[PDB]
Design a protein around this ligand. Structure first.
Ligand SMILES: Nc1ccn([C@@H]2O[C@H](COP(=O)(O)OP(=O)(O)OP(=O)(O)O)[C@@H](O)[C@H]2O)c(=O)n1
Ligand SMILES: Nc1ccn([C@@H]2O[C@H](COP(=O)(O)OP(=O)(O)OP(=O)(O)O)[C@@H](O)[C@H]2O)c(=O)n1
Ligand SMILES: Nc1ccn([C@@H]2O[C@H](COP(=O)(O)OP(=O)(O)OP(=O)(O)O)[C@@H](O)[C@H]2O)c(=O)n1
Ligand SMILES: Nc1ccn([C@@H]2O[C@H](COP(=O)(O)OP(=O)(O)OP(=O)(O)O)[C@@H](O)[C@H]2O)c(=O)n1
Ligand SMILES: Nc1ccn([C@@H]2O[C@H](COP(=O)(O)OP(=O)(O)OP(=O)(O)O)[C@@H](O)[C@H]2O)c(=O)n1
Ligand SMILES: Nc1ccn([C@@H]2O[C@H](COP(=O)(O)OP(=O)(O)OP(=O)(O)O)[C@@H](O)[C@H]2O)c(=O)n1
Lengths: 561, 561, 561
């Protein structure tokens, strides 16, 4: 096996993940089977305790674990299904060694941070790097290891020990390191010294960088590259630079044009992977398809405006997957994405006396947008405004997607306005009883579950985007579903539930009959959107906002003929 | 409250504990209420998993937890009952913060090594420093904090962060630090540089030493003190030196004569503790009694030779408490202690053909000794030789003490030789059934439990040493007890069980009627031996080995008239 | 005596000098006698070898040494005459200890970087801090020590050793340190970690900061101050911040409003300086006069445009003193300064075919400007264009100042256009002989020398600005003077030499009779411009460019009535 560490810097937030999965997207250009592990220095075992206000969105796996949010950036860049084990955390590894301590697996020795815990970290990395995350069941050929925090933190010290020892447990010419570092510009001059002091830190703990990659406000000057390479064990051609680019999807082409892979090919001696012709071809095809979606961003002539309406939209990382799912789809439509961020509570009739100015800004965004999106918010607060946003797109033929709480609110609105029933509400308003629009179903429902189309719904816009396939597989995070008692009334009035579960009891998709595009999903489709294969419910929202939905379904926008 | 850190060095094993509890023994000379915490960098939560072969003896508390062995050094030096919480460990504190993470006590924040875990360590130190470990229920006035490992270890990095922040959570003029450091002598010259490089390390993590204390092969030269104080923020009078001394019990007088406390009095402004006259007097009396037991070591004219017979006596830390209990008692008898270490298996009739040379060395030790001691060994291996050592002291009137497995073997031997019954054995040889000398009693029996003298046994040598008090309280670690069915036969033959438990079902002490000193205890009395109050079963063993037992009971050897 | 170090950062160029002399300007607000030392890590002994292209202008002392350029920033901020010894450099101190090594002043000991060279640095700082640099001959009360480079450089390591030892040779409560450090803003967030890593570096070498001062793109957030003070031994009120301000002369008011001195008053216990009432008053008056010149910058309604015409004006530090002399004077005139930078060679008739575009930009600047300034350039290259700039201001009544080479070119032009004599040139064109406008006078003439007005010249605009005083004292740097043989012809034609030397042989000032303001000086007056007392030849240039020269001479712009 081969491995690539991405680590480093004098600051957290320097740029690692885009240098990480982006480096891993280019390993796939070579035809390689590829995987990724994110090592987190924080002490949470999982994001299941972490509220979406800090550390952001609880990204959800095929295996239904609430992971680190960043893992998602690797399932889009590489096109892989990761697992709950690919997110190493400081709380996860202290728990695993402490479990073995009380089980007595150390044969009554004292157990130490070195060597026992640093062995555990190496034994975890080489365990997880066997798992076949890729489009065929063979073990990966390269693993990208991203070390979070900064080298020299008292929180990241166990992992730089474990990785140093791993440079020997794995060989040189099988392991390499990319160190990401700061070139601050002050008084209009690029200063090298934070890279010198952080490389002094790096060699102290015993890792040696095979590349340096700079966060800089500028293109690095020719002398700045020379004054970094005069102070580190790299040639001047391995001081990489992730400068300003037209969009984040260009970074793997930027790295490839900086000859980043033409070094890693030699430095990891990748002629030693015995690839079949099918893999070598599928590598070149993935690069061609990347050049196509990238070209479709530069060659983008016209804007699509989408209002994303939810709780606390100020906290923009809390909707990160939703944004990326809209970006992947917008490059298929060749159209520039313009998300309007609406706080759902600013739409309310009460907000007009309380905070009038922001209420007009919110309603201008809703009134301007070519599509509406209710994104699967957290808790009840935003609900009353999200109802009026769903009403706005039901009545006037605006394209719409509701995700999770958005299906809940598409159904509450269609109840509250098409059936009358003005008292109806989420099951969250428990003591109203008779008018609850939803029912509890704890089984929380999580992870990849199937969904099956109802066999008559040949008219459906959404089941056309899925290619007329009989079923789909999707991620879930819900404790409530629409009350089955009401569903015949909603189906008879035209809110047709075009997809249900294995039992047929659970409401998984709705489409409103004879509207240009009004969909909701109980699942979160943004947790399976990929840059070359956009998630179908979000592709339909952008394509109908562009007024091109028919031609996207007919195939006028696939990447290769 | 006031606090004293003891930390440091370029090596583990430099001398901390003797500089720690020894500094704490002198805080008690001032009359202060005193406590101690040992911070261990290892990842075991407790010594209950740790086999006695590495990290040594599982020291046992009043509260019955299997602690770090070193805690014992503080219960002898200070005269305090500690608790399972006074041994902070890296595995204990990661477990406590990870428990709060899954309970959700962090209110859905991400939880970090800084500030959350470094707050947990400070909140633990100031929690535990409230506990009244001393001879009256008031909270301690000084806490001695010993930081294990070395500063600059990747295992000790969380604790030097937590202690730095603690220098502010507690004030300066309430916290002080003693750093213990190496002065190697090579080519006959004292080199200062390992102290310079380790003090550079110390100030990097942000602690500042109020004293330096040197491990050195010599008295520090006047220039060595000056060349350390020219490189650290200490006066030349605060470079302390724990040099070679007549015995370890002299170290608090060495520190006091080096004016170590005459600085800490000012540096911790200890006039601010409002002591009552009773405390001030009991402080001076504790110093006088220390000068007495110390004088009784220098003024020691004659040797007592004791054979300690057990499994794997090569592993001398595995019997550490037993050695210290013999030392405390030997200073009461004014006699020099000479422990002969015997491997119990080398006494066996089989060892004579297998390894004849070591078998003669073992038997010469048994034949020479003025007393025999079977120390409460681990597992079955040594048993056959320990029987012959108990027989040797039953028949010939040699003084004897059996501790735990030693009472078991005193009873197996008295069965195997006085009752005949040559097939009898420990309950460990389970499938013999009918001839098992013991019975299972899991309740493992642990911690401080009472023991009550049988009301007729006024003749007893051991219940005389306990001052004719009605009951005693002692530590236990046993899964087996002598089978109650047999005890009438043993009592009638003269192996009188002079002490039993609350129920009267359990065999806690035996004394053989009409022998000069042949005792065993099911408890481990070495876990309550103190330097001014020696544990009575061990005092009797030394005093009878000295042939002075009568006069020790009559009071010819108490420290003050 | 008291002392203040200014040091630090993860980068060179962070802001030290403005935090240094600015802190020293506020020590003078307290009435204190004040001095400054700049410690340079570079190996040049003096700027006399350093070409003005790199490290910039060779600033010149009262004592005529070619110093570090930065010393000037302290002679403006404090109002002091420094000496060649106030610029400590790595080349200067290795030379001084190596001289004592060959003289044998070490009594045949081996001489070491510690302690001998670190003693030399301390013995230099306390030597120089005695020198009476101030407006009365008493020794200074505070010394500001600026440590150049960054802490943790292999070039600055001898000085952080010497300063650590100096924290003891001088007492605490006599020495304090200000550490200047970076808060980079990326992704719109202020990151603290470069300050944590550089403070870890600082405490390693053993200095402790009594203040931190941040270079930041922003006002520091309340949490950024707290997260620095949680990681350093400073209160949150001693994390100072030199943010963006209207001009550099506001920084001492910014520091004073951040309560910077209200701490240093206590931290250096400055009630212990026994000031007389005259000093206490002159302190408050200096603050009032600073508030006045600062107010005159904010209250500045109208611009003055000045063309500064010379060689290589792209290298803007090479003219630094000239810029500051124009700034000090512009605040007296209440007018906003706008220096147009002209490359002198772009004015040439040859430049019109060679590089036409830049030639028009150069001539637009010359044609726009309200005043012309020829700044005392280095070498011959620019001369031909500087002639045409002097002609432009002779003929059309534009205000003019020529400094050094500018007097040379004022005289070459007046010769070349008023006397005819079109072949005349600088003595630099040696082999023309008969038409050389100048003569060699090596004595190089350097340092503070007098100049005496010619006793009839009561009409003079410049000798009016000097207050009708009989003589002036000024800095020089010249190897050529105007040929005395010609001076009668120039005086008779109206280029009156209104000032000459002690002998009357040397051409020190000229004024053209009956022009609104056309001055030149052979000396460099910008080496004695101060912020409260602007250098008179530059005050006249700004005031005549403003058309207000009469009223400045009559006194309509002095700071206090
Ligand atoms: N392939 C990627 C990589 C990053 N991002 C986005 O960029 C931001 C985070 O970038 P990252 O690469 O993780 O840098 P930071 O986290 O800011 O810093 P670090 O280097 O510490 O990860 C987030 O919006 C993340 O979703 C993304 O959309 N796609
Ligand atoms: N010396 C330190 C300081 C912090 N941490 C931990 O590592 C993380 C790094 O986060 P970082 O972005 O460094 O936060 P700050 O320390 O505030 O750094 P910044 O100021 O850039 O946020 C911290 O959250 C904390 O978990 C650490 O290990 N060692
Ligand atoms: N009051 C004390 C202190 C120490 N010792 C003994 O000395 C040895 C350990 O000494 P210690 O002070 O702990 O030093 P080390 O552990 O060798 O090193 P460190 O400084 O790391 O603790 C053990 O036999 C311990 O029982 C003792 O008998 N009584
Ligand atoms: N931090 C230090 C200390 C000393 N030196 C210099 O390097 C030499 C090393 O000599 P050394 O043997 O280290 O002398 P000491 O510092 O006293 O070390 P030791 O105590 O082993 O003599 C010193 O003489 C002094 O010249 C140095 O460069 N850096
Ligand atoms: N009282 C001052 C201080 C500084 N400057 C100007 O500001 C620049 C240099 O600022 P300085 O304070 O020296 O910062 P740097 O040299 O950039 O960085 P350092 O902190 O390393 O000195 C130069 O134009 C210098 O003349 C000035 O005009 N007046
Ligand atoms: N590790 C180093 C590197 C350089 N220097 C010296 O200290 C000076 C600091 O200048 P600096 O501004 O740090 O130059 P760079 O090293 O290039 O840093 P920058 O990239 O910010 O210019 C250097 O010129 C060199 O004299 C040093 O002492 N130690």
């Amino acid at each position: 096996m081969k491995y690539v560490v991405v680590s480093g810097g004098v600051i957290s937030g320097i740029g690692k993940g885009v240098l990480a999965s982006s480096t891993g997207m280019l390993m796939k250009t070579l035809g390689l089977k590829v995987t990724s592990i994110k090592i987190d220095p924080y002490m949470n075992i999982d994001a299941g305790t972490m509220s979406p206000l800090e550390h952001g969105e609880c990204f959800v796996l095929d295996d239904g674990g609430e992971t680190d949010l960043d893992l998602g950036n690797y399932e889009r860049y590489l096109g892989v299904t990761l697992t709950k084990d690919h997110n190493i955390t400081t709380g996860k590894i202290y728990s695993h060694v402490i479990a073995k301590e009380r089980k007595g697996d150390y044969l009554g020795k004292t157990v130490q941070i070195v060597p026992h815990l640093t062995n555990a970290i190496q034994d975890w990395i080489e365990r997880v790097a066997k798992i076949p995350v890729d489009d065929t069941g063979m073990e990966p050929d390269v693993c990208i290891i991203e070390l979070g925090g900064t080298v020299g933190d008292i929180e990241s010290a166990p992992f730089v020990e474990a990785l140093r020892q791993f440079q020997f447990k794995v060989g040189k010419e099988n392991f390499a390191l990319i160190h990401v570092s700061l070139v601050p510009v002050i008084h209009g001059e690029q200063k090298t010294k934070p890279t010198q002091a952080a490389i002094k830190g790096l060699r102290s703990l015993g890792l040696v960088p095979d590349m340096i990659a700079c966060r800089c406000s500028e293109t690095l000057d020719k002398p700045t590259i020379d004054k970094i390479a005069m102070f580190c064990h790299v040639g001047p051609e391995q001081v990489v630079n992730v400068h300003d680019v037209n969009s984040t999807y260009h970074v793997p082409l930027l790295l490839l044009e900086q000859k980043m892979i033409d070094y890693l090919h030699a430095r990891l001696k990748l002629d030693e992977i015995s690839l079949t012709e099918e893999e070598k071809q599928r590598g070149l095809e993935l690069l061609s398809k990347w050049k196509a979606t990238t070209g479709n961003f530069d060659e983008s002539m016209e804007t699509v405006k989408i209002a994303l309406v939810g709780k606390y939209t100020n906290l923009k990382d809390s909707y990160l997957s939703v944004i990326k799912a809209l970006e992947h789809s917008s490059m298929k439509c060749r159209r520039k994405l313009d998300i309007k961020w609406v706080e759902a509570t600013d739409l309310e009739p009460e907000a007009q006396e309380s905070n009038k100015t922001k209420f007009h800004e919110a309603w201008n965004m809703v009134s301007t947008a070519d599509g509406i999106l209710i994104p699967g918010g957290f808790g009840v607060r935003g609900t009353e405004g999200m109802v009026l946003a769903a009403r706005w797109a039901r009545e006037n033929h605006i394209p719409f997607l509701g995700v999770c709480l958005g299906l809940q609110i598409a159904t509450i609105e269609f109840t509250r306005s098409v059936l009358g029933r003005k008292d109806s509400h989420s099951a969250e308003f428990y003591p109203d009883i008779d008018e609850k629009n939803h029912v509890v179903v704890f089984m929380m429902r999580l992870g990849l579950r199937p969904t099956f189309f109802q066999n008559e719904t040949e008219w459906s816009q959404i089941k056309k985007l899925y290619g007329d396939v009989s079923e789909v597989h999707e991620r879930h995070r819900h404790r409530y579903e629409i009350n089955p008692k009401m569903v015949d009334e909603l189906e008879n009035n035209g809110l047709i539930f075009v997809g249900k579960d294995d039992t047929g009891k659970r409401c998984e998709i709705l489409e409103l009959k004879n509207h240009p595009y009004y969909i909701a999903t109980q699942y979160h489709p943004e947790y399976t959107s990929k840059v070359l294969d956009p998630s179908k419910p979000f592709l339909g929202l952008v394509a109908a906002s562009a007024g091109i939905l028919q031609d996207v379904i007919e195939g006028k926008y696939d990447l290769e003929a």
